[model samples]
Each structure stands twice: as C-alpha cells, then as structure tokens.
Target: PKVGRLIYTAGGYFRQSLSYLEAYNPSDGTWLRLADLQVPRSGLAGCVVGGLLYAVGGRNNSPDGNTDSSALDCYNPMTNQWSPCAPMSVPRNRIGVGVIDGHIYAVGGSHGCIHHNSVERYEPERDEWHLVAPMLTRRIGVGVAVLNRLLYAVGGFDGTNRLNSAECYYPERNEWRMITAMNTIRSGAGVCVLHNCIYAAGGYDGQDQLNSVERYDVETETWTFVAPMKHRRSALGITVHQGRIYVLGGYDGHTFLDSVECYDPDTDTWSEVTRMTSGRSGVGVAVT
Candidate 1:
C-alpha cells in the first residue's frame, strides 16, 4: 500500500557510486532529482522511517577501505532538505540496516577489517544510539528488511564463507533466531519485498558473481528459486517499484555494471531496462 520510495545508490571501489539522489515516481516512470549527498559514499545503507529517508553507515573512496563513516543523514521529502542525524555508535559498512516501528536498526556488518556480529539502533526521538543484541552470525555483504514486525537478515559473507544462512530478530524477546536459508550462497546480495513476498537476488558466491534469484514466503519460511537474471550481479541495487522487482548497478568482480534488469512475478519473466551512464558496486536502492 506504500506509494513513493526514495531510491539511493552510492559508494564503490571506483568512486562510481556517485552522490546524486533521485526519487523514482512509479506512476510517471521518471526519475526526479531530489538532491545530492554532501559526501560521496559507497557501501551505505538507507531506509524510510517516520516520513523521512535516512542514510546510514558507508565508506568513502579510501585506499584501504578504512575510511568508514557513521554519517546519518535524513531527507525530508516535504521540504526537499537533507540534514544530519545522530550517527551510528558502531562503525558499520557492507551490511543491512532497516527500520521497524520507527526505530532504525543497524544489523550485521563490518568496518574495514573486522567482521562484526554487532547490532545497534537509533532512537530518533532522543537523537541517540543504543546497542542491541548482536546477530547470531558475524556477516558482511548482507541484506535485511522488516517483515511481519520482525527484522530479517538474509545471506551475507560470514568472514569465512559466503553464507546462505538467514536469521531474524525478535525485539520483544531481545534475541535472533536462524531462519530458512537462501538457496544460493550469496554475499553482496540485494533484497526487497513486493506483493507481501521477500525477494533476495544476485550476489557474489565467493569466487564468481551471480544473477540467480529467489523468493521467500513468510508463511512457508522457505525459499523458492525464481527466474535467473540477465547478468551476474554482485554488490548490486534492488527494490520493488510498481510491483516489479528492479535490480540495478552491481559488480561482477572484474567489471562494474551499469545495466539494469527487472523481474515480473505475474509472468515469471525478466527484462532489461535503460542502462546507467556508469557502472557501480556496493550501491543502495529503495522503492522510491
């Protein structure tokens, strides 16, 4: 029942993860320039909460990936202005972050060299951050979203291997429970929800990139492989717009990709869209 979503993509090895911001109007099939980021970033995560879009942890173009930022910036669609919020207490990058019931939750991710199991939350009312219970696994290159009032973390790199394992957080109980694993062992994957179902698509499988996709049903707690994508997508962007799955800009290891692809569940089909001007990896996308 949500209509508008702010789509954001930033950060990458080549600085191709540009700072520009666009709002996708599904009704008109156009990209509207909302504003641009003050800083160029890669490996960032964002979500809409309390009528504002929040940009969380990301890394700048640094030689060693040590230039990580906990910068929290919020955009007010009404005013078309973006301002800083309380940054994360823990440095998080290459992970999934989300919002549930208005609180921003930073799930599993890593800084530069450290793979962390840490979880943190930001209270927008108090303008402060708090430590939440860590995930059961320390993972990077993860995807997350809120479903049925719980925080679900999907496949990510678990320091040792590309993981197919998944987990969810129960805030009321202050604990995480492992959920049904993804069929593909994907790190650097992207996830979004459409028509009450969760879709986790294309990522790196340790050695090669991937374009294989899958869908998850909350009721069944299991995954079913969907139609494959047009190309292998690692560190890509994903979101559901106008009830269709939009996957964009990713790295296939050797090449950064600007090409975009989409999935239509009603027909079990995939199609190519207008490609981007440049390729990127570690990008972010929202239904907006």
Candidate 2:
C-alpha cells in the first residue's frame, strides 16, 4: 500500500464541535475535504494503522453542559466510510495518540478540569482497549509520538501548572519513566519525530501564546530552542510530510488559524504554505 504521500486532519474545534475531515496533498500544495468524522468532537486525537485511520475519544458539547466521549471510529479509504469500533475504557478529550507494534496508545487527557495520568492501548485485530501503566504525571493536551520503538509523551498541562516534564512508556514492561524535561513549559504544543529528533512547536504557556520551538535529542537527552514560527499558535495539528515538518491550523489567542507553515530541517527555517478552508484548533494530524 502507498504511504506518506498525503496528510490528513481529523475532527477538532473551530469555535464549536467539528467533524470535518480534510486531506492535504504535499506535491500539489492543495487541500481536499474528505468524509467527515462519524461524530463531532473537539480535543480529540487521531492515528493511522495498517492503512486505516482511527478517530478516537473526544468531547461532545451541548447547551445542557459537557460530556466526554469514549467513541472509537475507524475509516477505510477504500470503502470511503466510517464504522464504529470498541470504545475506549475511559471517556476523555485532549488526549495524545501514537502507534507502535501495530497497537494504538492513548495517553494523558482529561474530562472537564480533571487531568489524567491513565494510559491505554488498543489491539486492532481484537478491537479492544486495555489499560497500560499510567503516566508519571497527570496531563492533558499532551503531545505523543513513537520514536525508536518507544512512546514519548511530551509537555502539557498538569492541572494547576503548565508542564515541561516528559515521560516514556515501555509497552513490553508496562511501565513509564521520566525523561529530560523540555526547556519551556508548553501545553497544546505540536510534537513529532523528525530526523531522529523530537520537535515541539507553538503552544500556550499560561501567560501567553507562544511562538518558540524546541527539539529534544535522544542521544544527548536535551532540548534546544529552534526557529520560532512566524505566528504564535496553540492546539495545532502537526505532522511530517515530504521530509518537512508541517504545522497546520491552530489558535493564535484571539482567533483560530487556517494558515499553515512548513519547516525544512536542512534550512532550519519556517515558511508559509497554503491555508485550509476553515480555521481549526485542537486538530489531529497524521500522514498515511
């Protein structure tokens, strides 16, 4: 199956619940609207496994109040449709997601103001989610990625304070251990692995929107600041496409952003790219 040619953005917040699913073509520099998600969600996360895309847990807002969703929906490109899978054991939003060893891992997130340290993994073949060891610290709006066969959960909010702490999970041993913290506290930052390094970009740091960007070195166990984005962003969708790091729609304090940017590691610079049809924040991005 073909892979890494297209980038997809799933459900997120655009001042309201959004079920929109859109695709970006790196070669053409254009966006295409695909099938919407099965349900509207915000603060959700998505990941692709074995050629199928999974939209995981998020929240449903209403006039009455708020409620968390445990829904797990799978989308098959060939069929061009969405179908339900077994729901997550916990209902939450603002969660981080990653794939390793053919399993999907859902990391820290929360319902309402309560942060979570819980972690779980899903087995596609079995269509079931089982609890794994919880994270060392409770966090929401965390950034998660799989690098070198290990799952890394990066900076996020830990209830009272925005966090710079990071941790890694050992699926084989069902344990989590702390890692070197980020240089700055960042919640809702976009994190992804690029060229053997973990890059974390724009996020909210309690006082203001942030444009600062940093990268973590696995070998040295350190984080170093890099070129900041042209615009400040938080709750953005981030992914690696065509050898460049792409940061998509996010909130810039006052307004949501439809603008996009891509960074070339060789140049260590960020450049504006095409914009999406609508502004989005807390969106999920993955390449498939």
Candidate 3:
C-alpha cells in the first residue's frame, strides 16, 4: 500500500547500518531500518518495474574515487532477497532510469569524469539489453520518467555547467527530441511525475544548493515553478507514491542530510518528514 512503510539502503559507502533504524519515513517523523543492500554503492539509479526494485550502475567509493560498475541487482520485497540481473553495457554513476511497456530504460550518467548521453533498454522477459539512441546533450545526475510511452529526461550537469535543458525519448522509434528547458539550471536534483506532470526539485547550481522546485506539463509543453523545499539539497532521490511527492537523502552544501520532505500538489505546500538514520548523497529511489 505505501511501499512497505520504509526506506532502505547500504548507507552509500560511508555509513554502516547493521540494524534497521537507518531508513527514513515520508509520512511520519522517524527513521527505521529494514534491510541493507547486498552491495554498498553510491551514484546509482533505482527503478521499479513489474513489482521488482532494480539498482544499476554506481561507484563503490568516493573522494579519491573508484572504478565505475555496471552491476545490476534486483530486490524482491515479498521475499527480502536480492538477486543479480543482466548488467548494463557501460559502467556509469548517477544514471537515470525509466520504465515503458515492461522494459527498463537506463538513461544518462557519468563514466569517471566524462558525462554520457547513451540510453540502454533492458527487457526482463528475455533478459537482454538493447542500445537505444543517445540524448543530444551529454549529462550526469539527470532525471527520467515515462509518460504516455514517451520517456522524459530532465535537468542535470554537463561538466561545464548545470543544465536547464530537457529532452524526451521515443522507445518505438529509438529517438530523442529536445523539449522545453527548465527555469533553473541545476544538478543532483530529484525529479518525479505526479498527476501527469514532471516536478524537479532541490539541487546545486554550481554556486550554491537550491531549495527551488519546477514542473513540466507535457500537454502544454511548458515548464513552470512550484513550491520550493524548506531545506535546500542536492544528490537526492524523489518518488511519487500514494499521491504525494517524496524527496529523500541529499547534501546541503555544508553536510550530507538524512532529511526527508514531501510536496502536496493539491495544497501547494511543503512538509518535512522523518530524517534518515545515515546522512547520504547520490542514493536512488523508485516507486511501483
């Protein structure tokens, strides 16, 4: 009903969680643990398709850095078991993922210091991967969501600067088309679709962390402003579940944050929820 009433992770390579209390809550003001990921990683993208949670392509270390990985893992909430899946062709970090017609599409991410524009689609039924058309602009830390068979990729950084540009992917034609640009150029923001529109929130603009929020309407093909977060952050995760948008785990420039916040489109207001046990950045989230 509420995606198990908990959030779980391996603490993003820096923090350790042997017990549960590490998870954050979006409805209540508490942190609880569930189960840790089989592997500790950061800068990964998490997506749910067909009732399964998939974690793909991330780095194992930070600061000095480590090699990029393409390992894919799927977790079954019903059984609390993690299983390996077909890996992505290219190793990347901070990738964007979206699902369409039972297939999972892994979009733009970073390979070391190089940003990527590649898009890869995975077919779970056949356990195969097919390379699709790349985006026009290369980026890292982008956001992706599927709406009416079209996959929308939102703002992120292009190494040189934060981006306000957006694009859409057509799976059937294996092509991409530029869409309306966001009002703010940012990276490491959280994006989710709610009530047929895409909302982007909380990221850095190369100068400072932001608490601002923006939305894109597919019907009108326009981007507009929405309510800003109470606290500014970046490298966060956002998901829409039970008619609310939940933003979780990001950095506030000074420190990593475990804080969770939610936005109610019906009311146009923002509220803080339970803070995560471990402060982290670059964590991934998904809702089915």
Candidate 4:
C-alpha cells in the first residue's frame, strides 16, 4: 500500500477460505470493499507502476504442500478488471517485486525444490522480458523495494540456511552489489520505505517468528534497529500510504492473523490499527 492511501489485500493460503476482505481507511479507521483477486494465491508479490497493480509469482498451498507458480496478473482499479501478463521464466514462491524507471523487477524466490538467485525485468510497453544480472547469492522469501532508482533485496532463506545478507540492483548498469547485512537473519519479512528509509519487520528465523524491526539508511549504507512490532509474525504484508507505514495480516506461528499496525516516523512509534476483516498470510499489498 502507498503511504496514507487505502488499498486492499487479497486472501492467501489461510485467508483464502474466508472469501471476504475489508480495506482500512487510516483517516477514519473505516473498512471498505475494493475488489477481489482473479486468482486466490499465497506468497504473491505485488508492485505498483503507472497506477496499475502487478501481482507476480507465489505459491498456492500450505508450506508443507506448496506449489510454486509463475503467474503474472495485472489489475486495473479504475475499470476493475484483471488482465493476464507474461509469466515469470521460473516458478517461485515468496518472491519480491519492485518497479524502477517504469520497468518491473522480480528478484529471489523459490521454485518449491530450490531457492533462486535469478533476477529478471519486465517492460510493459515492449511486452517482453529480459534477464538481468543475478544476485550474488541464492535466497527465497526476500523483501524488495525501490529507492533512489535502485532495487534493494533484503534477507531471505537460502537453500541451506537463513540469510541476513542484503543486496542492491542497479538497473542502469544491470548489476548487483552487496550491501550492509541485516541485524537478524530472517525470511517472510515485510519491507517498505517510509521517511526515505527502508524498514523490514516481522519474519521467522528458523527457531522462532520475530517482532523485531530494522531500518536501512540508504545515504549512509547502514542498518539500525527501530521499534519492534506488537506481535511475532512472518509472511506479512507491508506498504507505505499517506506518509504512514501499514503492516497488515500475517501468521504469528500457530495461526493466521488480521492484526494491522501503523508506524509514525515523526514519533518513531507504532500504534495498532483496525485489523483486516480476515486473517491471512503471504498476501500482497499495493496502492492505486
């Protein structure tokens, strides 16, 4: 979700069974119906470019019985229609998608059997796909966001282990460079930019789910700990809207959750908001 705006998140994995959702209006603490996803899925990635929502790769089943998908679907809120787009070259789950200079970039994710280091770009006007330089390491469930025209991919699970490594993709040069590692190794964390800083929060670290939050200062190339979330969660949805950061539904460990939290950068604090109508995990968020 974009800062301060109202956006909807589709049901995924657990919430798919619920069949209904409510979008929160921060100003009034009200919920409204927007639209439903054409396909019910989990672990999907979403990015907004030119006012359109693009949902990329994800899984369709529980983690114990997951199926990776390469499906790419675009949603037009103005007309309320979903149009099929080019699918990813490789099937992936829990991947990250970001937009830079009118192009969409898909980064690290897993194909059920293996996590990937693959990086690819999509040009809507050209209706074509091209491979960019792959990341230096393979990771799945990474968090990605665009800042200053560069794409940053945060912590995720590599094949053999969890990772704290973070990297940046420079579209102009078509290359990736290692960056400062996160304070904690995690996967399924939500990544968003607020107040010109990248914030990552709520992910699992093998032994336990986390409520810890960390921020990256692009100018200084450093990481700093911020306020921890109210609950331990992973596979969460995060977006910046109206200059406020919104953290939406995710699993806490034993069950799905509809909990929503808002971060106020000016105050450096997080306050709970109205929860979504239903609990979910692995859903995507984007502002129209």
**Top model by lDDT, which number?**
2
TM-scores, all models, native as reference: 0.90, 0.96, 0.90, 0.92
- For every candidate in turn, the CA RMSD to the true structure comes to 2.8, 1.7, 3.0, 3.0
Q: What TM value does model 4 have? A: 0.92
| Pick by TM-score: 2 or 4, better one | 2
Estimate, for each residue in 200-276, the C-alpha lDDT of model 1 and write its tens digit. 88988777899899888989878998899988888887877667887877887678887778788999899986565
Model 1: CA > 4 A from native: 1-6, 10-17, 62-66
Lowest-sum lDDT 10-residue window in model 2: 1-10
**What's the CA error at residue 28 for candidate 2, in Å?**
0.6
Residue-pair clashes per prediction, in order, are 4, 0, 3, 7
Native-referenced Cα lDDT, model 1: 0.78
Top candidate on TM-score is 2
Error of 1 at 286 (Å): 2.3
Off by over 4 Å in 2: 1-4, 62-65
lDDT of 2 by residue, 120-163 (tens): 89999999999999999998989998899899999999888899
Residue pairs in steric clash, candidate 2? none
Give candidate 4's whole-model lDDT: 0.82
Could you give the candidate ranking by TM-score, starting with the highest?
2, 4, 1, 3
